[PDB]
Each structure stands twice: as C-alpha cells, then as structure tokens.
A paper describes a structure:
All cytohesins share a common architecture comprised of a heptad repeat coiled coil (CC) domain, the Sec7 domain, and a pleckstrin-homology (PH) domain. The PH domain binds phosphatidyl inositol 3,4,5-trisphosphate (PIP3) and/or phosphatidyl inositol 4,5-bisphosphate (PIP2) (Chardin et al., 1996, Kavran et al., 1998, Klarlund et al., 1997), with affinities, specificities and spatiotemporal distributions dependent on splice variation in the phosphoinositide-binding pocket (Cronin et al., 2004, Klarlund et al., 2000, Ratcliffe et al., 2018). Two autoinhibitory elements, the Sec7-PH linker and C-terminal helix/polybasic region (CtH/PBR), strongly suppress GEF activity by occluding the active site in the Sec7 domain (DiNitto et al., 2007).
Unsupervised reference-free classification of ∼10,000 manually picked particles from 500 micrographs yielded 53 good quality classes representing ∼6,500 particles. To explore this possibility, the 2D class averages were systematically compared with 3D volume projections over the range of possible views for each model in the MultiFoXS pools. For two class sets corresponding to compact or intermediate best scoring models, 3D volumes could be built and refined. Automated docking of the MultiFoXS pools with the refined 3D volumes selected best scoring models having relatively compact conformations similar to the more compact models in the six-state MultiFoXS ensembles.
Residue numbers in the entry:
A (entry chain A), B (entry chain B): 3 to 399
Write the structure that this text describes.
Amino acid sequence: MGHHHHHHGSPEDLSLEEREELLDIRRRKKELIDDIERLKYEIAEVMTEIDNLTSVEESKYTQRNAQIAMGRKKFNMDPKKGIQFLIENDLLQSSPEDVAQFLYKGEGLNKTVIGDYLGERDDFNIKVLQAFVELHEFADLNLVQALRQFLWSFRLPGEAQKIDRMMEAFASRYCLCNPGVFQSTDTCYVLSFAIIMLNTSLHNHNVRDKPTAERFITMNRGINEGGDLPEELLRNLYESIKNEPFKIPEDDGNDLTYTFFNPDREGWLLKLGGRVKTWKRRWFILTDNCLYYFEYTTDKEPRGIIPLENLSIREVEDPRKPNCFELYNPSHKGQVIKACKTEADGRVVEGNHVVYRISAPSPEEKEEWMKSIKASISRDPFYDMLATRKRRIANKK
Amino acid sequence: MGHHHHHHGSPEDLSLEEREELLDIRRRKKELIDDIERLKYEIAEVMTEIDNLTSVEESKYTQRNAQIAMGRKKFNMDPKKGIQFLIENDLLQSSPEDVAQFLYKGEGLNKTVIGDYLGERDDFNIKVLQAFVELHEFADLNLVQALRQFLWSFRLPGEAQKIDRMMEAFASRYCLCNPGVFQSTDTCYVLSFAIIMLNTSLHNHNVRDKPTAERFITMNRGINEGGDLPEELLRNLYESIKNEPFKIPEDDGNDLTYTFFNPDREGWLLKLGGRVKTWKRRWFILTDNCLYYFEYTTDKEPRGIIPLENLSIREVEDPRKPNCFELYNPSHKGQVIKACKTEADGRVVEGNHVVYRISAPSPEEKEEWMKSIKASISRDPFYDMLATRKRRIANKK
Ligand SMILES: O=P(O)(O)O[C@H]1[C@H](O)[C@@H](OP(=O)(O)O)[C@H](OP(=O)(O)O)[C@@H](OP(=O)(O)O)[C@H]1O
Ligand SMILES: O=P(O)(O)O[C@H]1[C@H](O)[C@@H](OP(=O)(O)O)[C@H](OP(=O)(O)O)[C@@H](OP(=O)(O)O)[C@H]1O
C-alpha cells in the first residue's frame, strides 16, 4: 500500500484500508459458509446413522441400497409394479413430482421402460410426465439444445400415440421456458420432428439427399402458423445437428432419431401390367402410404392407385428390364392386390395384380424407391400422427 | 416427592441421542448464518463509509437510518401509514414485491402487525401476501420445515378470515414448490392445521391425550381428496414436531400454535334438571359448539341440545354430586338459556334452565370437559372456518 501523508488528523479514514477490511470480512463470511456446509454434511450423516436404526452397529450390508436396488429391477420388469413397490416400502414418496424425480435421476433404470411409462394415457402418468419435463430446464436453450437433454432422459416409445404425448409435453415446456420464440406449441412440435428427420438425413448413410442449410430453411417455410421463422434461428439448429448428431442412451442403432426417413417420393418408373403383362412408363407419386401413377406429368387424375398397407418388397431379376422389384402381399399368396385403376373408357375399376413388378431407371433410383416404400409402410401410424398435426399447423382463412 | 397436579414426572424418558445431536448442529448452523448476516451488514457499513456521498457527520445516526427508523415505528403503529411514509419519502419502492421484501426482512417490525397487514382483504395487501410467500423458498422442504420458516416471519392474526387468507397463500405456495405431494391445496391446508393441532397436543401440558405416530396416521385418513397420504410422509412430520415444537417470534405464550385445542368430546355425565332438579346420567356429545345429550348411546335422536354460544363455565360445590360445574349466561342473570329438549310424549320444546349444572365421573373428566367446552366457545369462528374447508376437502368419487 504505502502510506498517505496524514497532515489532516486522526479522523482520516483510508478507502484502501476500508476496502481491505471489507475483503477480510468477505473471506470470513466464506469461511463461515464452509463451516455451515460441513455442519449440514455432519447432520446428514447423523440422519443416515439414525435411519435403519433397528440393526447391528456394524452391519455387512446396506438395507436402503438393497431394497432400492430390487425396486429398480422391479420397475424395469413392470414400471407400474416397481413404482408401487417403492411407494409401499417407503423408498419413494407417492406424488407425481417424487416419481418424476426418481425417473429423471434414472439410476439403474431402463430408459425404454421410462419412455413406456411416461407415454401412458393414465391420469397419474400424465402428471408424472408433466413433472418430468419440468425437471428439464429449457430456458435460454435453443430447440436442439433442449431436445438433446430431453432425448437423453428416456427412449421414445414405439406407439404413435405415446410419441405424441411426450413430444407435446416437450413442446409445451419449451414454449413456456422460451416465450415468444414460436407462435404456437404446434410450431415447436412440428419443427422438433423436422430436426429429428434432419438428424436421420445428415447422419444415416442410407440417406443420400443431405440437405444444405439453405435447403432446411426452405423446407420449414410457413411453419410459424403461416409465417416464417428467422433464418438465423433455423441456421443455428441446422449447424448444431450437422456438427453433432443426437446422442441416444442405451443405443441399439434402431432409434427413431436415426431412422426417421422421408416416406415420400416422385419420379419415373416402368411398371408391368396386371392380367396383360406389358411394360409402361408412368409418373409415380408416393404419398399418404399410396403409390399413385400417371400417364403424363400433366394429368390431373391418376391412372391407378396402389395402397401400400400390408404389402412388402422383394427384388427380382427380369428377362427384359433392369433394376426390378415387386410389391406383393405375403399373407395372401396368389390373390389379387386391392387397388384401383382407370380403363381406356374412363371407368374406375379394381386392379388385377397378384404382384406389381416395377423397373427403376438406375440401380440408385431402385434403392431410393425401395427405401421410401419400406419407410412409408413401416412407420405409417407415426407419419399419420404428424400429418394430422401438420394440418392444424397450417391455417386456412 | 409429590407435586400438586398430575403432570410432573422425571426427565428419564429422553428422545434419541442422535436426533438431539442433529438439533444441536442445526442450532449451530443457524448461529453461523446469523454471524454471516452480521458480517454482511458490517461490510455494507464499510462500503457506505468508503463512499463519496457519505460525509463526516456531527450526528450520531445518519439520514437514511434515522428516517427508516421512524418509518418502522410508524408501521408498527399503523402498517398502512408506515408503508405510505416509507414510499412517500423514497425509503421504500411502491410495488407489492418491494413492500413484501421490507416485511420479510422485518427489521424493527412488530410481527403481529405484519400478520394484521398481510391478512387484509385489500387488493394491494393480497398482492403483498403473494410476494411475501414467494420470498419463502419451500422447494425440497417437508411441510413442517416450510411451516417453521413461514411461522417465524409473522404472527397469525386473530380474525378467522385473516388466518384463512394466509394459510391459503402458504398452502398454494407449498404445493407449487412441491408438485405432486398433495392432491389439492385443500389437502395441504387441512394437513397444515393438523400439524398445528399436533404441536399444541404434544407440547401444551393442558393436553392429556398425546397422540402416537400411529394415531396421527389414523387421524389423517382420507385427507388426500379421499385417499391416504404415505405413512412415511406422515411419520416424518409427526417426528419433527415431536422432536421440536414450533418456534414462535415475540412469543407471549398465547399463540394459536400452542393453544389450538380439540373442541370435541364424548362421554358420560350427570346433569341436573331444569325446573325439576333431578340428576340424570346422559351420553354427551360436544360438536359444532353444541352439547348434545342422549338417554342411551343407541338413541338416534338427542334428549336435548344446548348451544354453547354466549355461555361460560363456573365450578360449583354440590351437596350430593362430585366434580360439578355450571353453564350459564353471564349477560342474562336469572333468564332461561336458549335450548331444546324432548318431553316424554316426544314433543320438542324449549328448555327451562337458568343454568346447566353438570357432574363429571372424576376430577380428571371434569377438567377435560371444561377445557373442551371453553376451547369450543373461545375459537368457534375459527373451528367453523376449518369445518367449511374440510367439507370441500371431503369429496365424493
Ligand atoms: O395398355 P396395354 O398394353 O393394353 O396393357 C395394360 C397396361 O399395362 C395397364 O397399365 P396402365 O394402367 O398403367 O396403363 C395395366 O393396368 P394396371 O394399371 O392395372 O397395371 C393393364 O392390366 P390389366 O388390366 O390387368 O390387363 C394392361 O392390360
Ligand atoms: O325425569 P324427571 O325426574 O321428571 O326430571 C326431568 C329430567 O331431569 C329432565 O332431564 P332429561 O331431559 O335429560 O331427561 C329435565 O329436562 P332438561 O333436559 O331440560 O334438563 C326436566 O327439566 P324440566 O322439564 O325443566 O323440569 C326434568 O323435569
């Protein structure tokens, strides 16, 4: 420090000295706080000693640990029964909030089972799901950041209805934590699945079309209840996913986040006739789990419509045409597939196909079509869920 | 030895040693916290000294301190006027939140006056009460722990309506901080008063029936909107209160938490007739601030009903019967007490009593009855408040 002249008199107080004193006081306060923390720890230890009182002073094993361990295993076998066991035996309190804290901690818990339980339509489960999402702190996180945390805590159920409940809870929570970002919960929900599809698109090699940042901006046009979201916001989300894929717990490689494919496609194919086996070039549109085909790209009405429900694909070698596969019903051998087409006179009639043999222009287009068709068939209930949700997202005047 | 009344034993039955140690540790922690607060205050003073605006002063106390001191005294005289003085003179900002912070700090404030002010039905006061409970951090505290903090910050008003507002604010805050614990705010509210009655029961010597942990579990059956709360939860609450009574600020010994008696009782008594002074044994039920008496325990209809409104008790010596007291109206000497009874023919008529002389089977039963009756009369508006609240608690499925 050095000293000051001090001609003035004994009342002269020195700011530096006062500051130093203040610092010392602060240090003392910190020490006191540390002491308090230590005391708290001691108290906790005492409580532990008290609890499991009827025992031998030195016991080999831990009552609490043993009982909780068995309860967790019970939960993994049947979540309803596990929760019940833990509540009955006072290892867990009975409120939705306490159950949610148990699930969020998730120690020794199967995260798929967590997802199965949180996605149930029961009133208790609904309340646990709310408290569960409330344990996720979404304020000041972008949508991908929030999704990363949420998707670490459980594994998405397979049932479309269950996936919906959980993503609705997520979207509602995000919007409450980040007001003014999205115009509606519906916007947040649909954008969330856009992000999930992008994760699949960019990180699964079975997906050839790798969307650019500009492309992802264009795909989400009108999502904000008719309006567009800020380009900067969409870019940040795109770049986060591009940089790092969703990290999934207990990952089996089969997760929706990695295998959420676009079920829609358009393009030229040759198709073999039903009763009369002639090859025809047609413009095909795969949409709504149906294969629509047209004589010309300018036709308003399809030449035919093939519902894909209950069908599967097999590759075939054809004597004349390259890159062939067949659609067929594996349950109904030798039976006509339910479909409709238009005759030359304009009459709409039933198709006469036991199989639909299709030839693609290239091996690469063959693979694209088979992927799209398989994806469309395999996740239809889920794509239907999103489609019904997207309609309410789009607003008509 | 020998003492006059039957309520002084020896200290032999102690509590559990570990628990006592924990309590001591908690006390130490509290002391440390107080020390830290003092240090902080000192630091603030040092900062003020360092600061430029602070001149050397001829005066013992400074402008801010002097003005705030007078304002606090004004508040204690008339809370509305005190707040106004502090706001007008820029010693306190005008929002409910700032006023609530002033009240919560409570420096040099009468905590009874704090309670009077927070319990007012005015719109501003209602908003201050909300902000006041928001300054209490109830997350991860059990209901007793939260009650201890809340009941340190102010003294409960005497008006039933005011008590209701404050306990409603408390219960709502607790449930928001601890979601899923109680099924309703009503559950939290009624359980809170169960805890308060237990405090009186276990810690006031005028109360002979000391409920066990099992007893307290049984008393709260169906409280959770028809359902039962977890036995472990109720045990923790019971043991906390048993171990340590509610610590009340500026304690005069007259606080509700110490003098919240059960106003209800049943049992055998002899009663002296009205016009014709014959002694009859009757089964008595004290409920709803009324004394109902029956010829037989199996009777559906009472022999008579004595409203206790406006009555008081005096002990008397009787020539024939032991352990006697009289109910009488001190305002209406020599006048018949409003009551009803049934004649032998079944006609319901008015009673002819100037006084009701009652004889109890033992001195101990006499004391129990007089306590119950006095308690019932003295706090009727409040018991009525709880009763109307408990009805909405009991719901049908
Ligand atoms: O045009 P020609 O050479 O006469 O042969 C037709 C076309 O291949 C039709 O295809 P498209 O409808 O695309 O024109 C086909 O109908 P499908 O669409 O049902 O395959 C007819 O099947 P049958 O009606 O089953 O013979 C087949 O007779
Ligand atoms: O039975 P007997 O010996 O004839 O005397 C009766 C009983 O004592 C009654 O008590 P209870 O009603 O409990 O049977 C009492 O009524 P109260 O209930 O009003 O005390 C009558 O009072 P009067 O009616 O005031 O005389 C008194 O006449």
